[PDB]
Design an enzyme around this catalytic site. Structure first.
Site, PDB file in Angstrom:
ATOM      1  N   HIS A   1      39.401  31.046  39.213  1.00 23.68           N
ATOM      2  CA  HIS A   1      40.375  31.994  39.778  1.00 23.68           C
ATOM      3  C   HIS A   1      40.169  32.289  41.281  1.00 23.68           C
ATOM      4  CE1 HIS A   1      37.842  35.617  39.681  1.00 23.68           C
ATOM      5  NE2 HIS A   1      37.453  35.276  38.456  1.00 23.68           N
TER       6      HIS A   1
ATOM      7  N   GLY B   1      34.140  41.465  43.522  1.00 24.00           N
ATOM      8  CA  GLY B   1      33.311  40.554  44.296  1.00 24.00           C
ATOM      9  C   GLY B   1      32.129  39.992  43.529  1.00 24.00           C
TER      10      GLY B   1
ATOM     11  N   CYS C   1      32.312  38.313  40.759  1.00 21.52           N
ATOM     12  CA  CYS C   1      32.673  37.081  40.076  1.00 21.52           C
ATOM     13  C   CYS C   1      31.832  35.895  40.531  1.00 21.52           C
ATOM     14  CB  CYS C   1      34.168  36.805  40.199  1.00 21.52           C
ATOM     15  SG  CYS C   1      35.206  38.062  39.407  1.00 21.52           S
TER      16      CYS C   1
HETATM   17  C1  LIG Z   1      37.365  43.708  39.816  1.00 20.82           C
HETATM   18  C2  LIG Z   1      36.247  43.173  38.958  1.00 20.82           C
HETATM   19  C3  LIG Z   1      35.147  43.970  38.648  1.00 20.82           C
HETATM   20  C4  LIG Z   1      34.136  43.465  37.854  1.00 20.82           C
HETATM   21  N1  LIG Z   1      34.141  42.227  37.352  1.00 20.82           N
HETATM   22  C5  LIG Z   1      35.195  41.451  37.645  1.00 20.82           C
HETATM   23  C6  LIG Z   1      36.276  41.868  38.428  1.00 20.82           C
HETATM   24  N2  LIG Z   1      37.423  41.064  38.640  1.00 20.82           N
HETATM   25  C7  LIG Z   1      38.447  40.869  37.767  1.00 20.82           C
HETATM   26  O1  LIG Z   1      38.452  41.320  36.621  1.00 20.82           O
HETATM   27  C8  LIG Z   1      39.599  40.022  38.317  1.00 20.82           C
HETATM   28  C9  LIG Z   1      40.695  40.849  39.001  1.00 20.82           C
HETATM   29  C10 LIG Z   1      41.502  41.598  37.969  1.00 20.82           C
HETATM   30  O2  LIG Z   1      42.081  40.751  36.937  1.00 20.82           O
HETATM   31  C11 LIG Z   1      41.407  39.602  36.591  1.00 20.82           C
HETATM   32  C12 LIG Z   1      42.005  38.834  35.600  1.00 20.82           C
HETATM   33  C13 LIG Z   1      41.430  37.632  35.227  1.00 20.82           C
HETATM   34  C14 LIG Z   1      40.265  37.222  35.842  1.00 20.82           C
HETATM   35 CL1  LIG Z   1      39.455  35.788  35.265  1.00 20.82          CL
HETATM   36  C15 LIG Z   1      39.673  37.965  36.841  1.00 20.82           C
HETATM   37  C16 LIG Z   1      40.229  39.182  37.223  1.00 20.82           C
END
Ligand SMILES: Cc1ccncc1NC(=O)[C@@H]1CCOc2ccc(Cl)cc21
Ligand SMILES: Cc1ccncc1NC(=O)[C@@H]1CCOc2ccc(Cl)cc21
Ligand SMILES: [Cl-]
Lengths: 305, 301
Positions: free
Chosen positions: B41, B143, B145
């Protein structure tokens, strides 16, 4: 989101862990520059540990008696000296992995990461706090002596602890990197007991702020208290006194959440007098006191090292 | 003595953390040999989060679109491929700090250490378990990820997790290092919910054995139970079924303490019925389920 007991990344400390062997005793040493620091009881036997005269035992030692091993490489000790309860073994080779570091003595309530080692090899890392009774509630088996406690500020490691012993209650006692023991402990096989412990009040409040940042607010209330009235209640429940310094340190969290420190104190007062009533805070049924205000800010705002 | 939530030393993983930037998105990557692994992503925009077609978005990318930074050194991407939900950026430099490693897919109840990173920089290390609902209860901000979950056997790192997303309840979803998500999750902003979580029963029993090894015995009782009767009770407290495999895995701890698995199961049943009555086990007022039998043996011996 999420709140966990989080240790500092241990990489900078892992590159300093060596094995120190003196006769039959094998423990860990901290190799920084051309010096290896380790507990001075590495020179003791069963007879010696009952009542050891460390100056006399060390005078009988020669540099070649200390076998120091960094990975599968034997380091040659070219000098030895003692500073309080720590032994300093001068080696011929400066550790190429030596990070930027300082030796710091911490206060009770302050937290640090422990890199548990066995035979100069890191096995685990955990976050723990220097209890108000100056013990640490670690996890250490025989051979873990010489394992170090540290913090990281920016790109600098502040070494604050070196493990020397385990008390009868299973709690641990050790020294700073200058060999000064934390607490009224001595490095001898003798009767020693950890004093009655108290809860680290400022850290409990910091963890309640962490819970609010994570959406847990059931414990919040409309009430506030004076610092004096809160300390009266704190003394009653074996909680450390909350000083004005603790209130000011909690300031940023108080501003971030909109809950004054004395307002959070009235929540803590009710939690002590009434309990959790089957509810949990951050997945815990007890009040956690091993997260300082700086730890909460660091984890909730993602500071990196 | 002592029992703590203990993470593996993170040094071998720290030397692999890099920053991956694609357009406006910046997350972490795992640099092993000449490959940087990161969540796919990173190639998504605002309009491409609900229903991203990753094959189509990646075909529009060139190697120079991916900015990879290892410390203050820019790495040059010379190739890119996608394996399930992970992106593999082939670079022109093998990581000199590459440890001995393996990619392992773990089962629910398994624990691992997480090296939380922001901008390719490690910020902290903690321990956690793959929940029975396939989420992890991590500590992650925007951040994070690309932060990885791992275990260490001797000198080898087994990478088992790569963080991808946070669910509405604050729990986290991610994949193994082959890009296969743990759980019924997809890397899309579509409505996704973590299923009801359950307590990892085998881990609770392992932690009760850890408590006995550490001298805590107040919870022990003279009773034993059948595996079936234990499971009928356990399920009522949203506890995972205890299989015969779990009973076999608890064998060494049962032998070390002299308390049969079904004997400890009856102690667990009583604890579930009575609560703790103001008492704690290993400093905890709740039953801890994020220590596997392997973790207990390792830490206690
Ligand atoms: C912001 C954050 C905080 C902690 N861990 C992860 C995140 N990020 C997320 O969740 C992001 C942004 C939001 O939506 C999605 C949807 C799908 C996927 Cl794979 C990623 C994400
Ligand atoms: C066995 C163990 C476990 C964890 N941490 C440390 C140890 N080791 C010890 O405590 C050793 C052996 C016992 O006697 C004493 C007395 C004083 C001192 Cl400084 C050291 C020791
Ligand atoms: Cl602060």
């Amino acid at each position: 989101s999420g709140f966990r007991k989080m240790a500092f990344p241990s990489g900078k400390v892992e590159g300093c862990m060596v094995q120190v062997t003196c006769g039959t005793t094998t423990l860990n040493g901290l190799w920084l520059d051309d010096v290896v620091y380790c507990p001075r009881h590495v020179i003791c036997t069963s007879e010696d540990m009952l009542n050891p005269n460390y100056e006399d035992l060390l005078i009988r030692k020669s540099n070649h008696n200390f076998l120091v091993q960094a990975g599968n490489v034997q380091l040659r000790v070219i000098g030895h000296s003692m500073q309080n309860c720590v032994l300093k073994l001068k080696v011929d080779t400066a550790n190429p992995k030596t990070p930027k570091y300082k030796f710091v003595r911490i206060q009770p309530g302050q937290t640090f990461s422990v890199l548990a080692c066995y035979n100069g090899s890191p096995s685990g890392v955990y976050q723990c706090a220097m209890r108000p009774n100056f013990t640490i509630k670690g996890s250490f088996l025989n051979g873990s002596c010489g394992s170090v406690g540290f913090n990281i500020d920016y790109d600098c490691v502040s070494f604050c602890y070196m493990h020397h012993m385990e008390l009868p209650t299973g709690v641990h006692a050790g020294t700073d990197l200058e060999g000064n023991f934390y607490g009224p402990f001595v490095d001898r096989q003798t009767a020693q007991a950890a004093g009655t412990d108290t809860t680290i009040t400022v850290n409990v409040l910091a963890w309640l702020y962490a819970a609010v940042i994570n959406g847990d607010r059931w414990f919040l209330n409309r009430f506030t208290t004076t610092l004096n009235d809160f300390n009266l209640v704190a003394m009653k429940y074996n909680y450390e006194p909350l000083t004005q310094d603790h209130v000011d340190i909690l300031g940023p969290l108080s501003a971030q959440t909109g809950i004054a420190v004395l307002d959070m104190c009235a929540s803590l007062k009710e939690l002590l007098q009434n309990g959790m009533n089957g509810r949990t805070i951050l997945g815990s049924a007890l009040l956690e006191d091993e997260f300082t205000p700086f730890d909460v800010v660091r984890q909730c705002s993602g500071v990196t090292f």
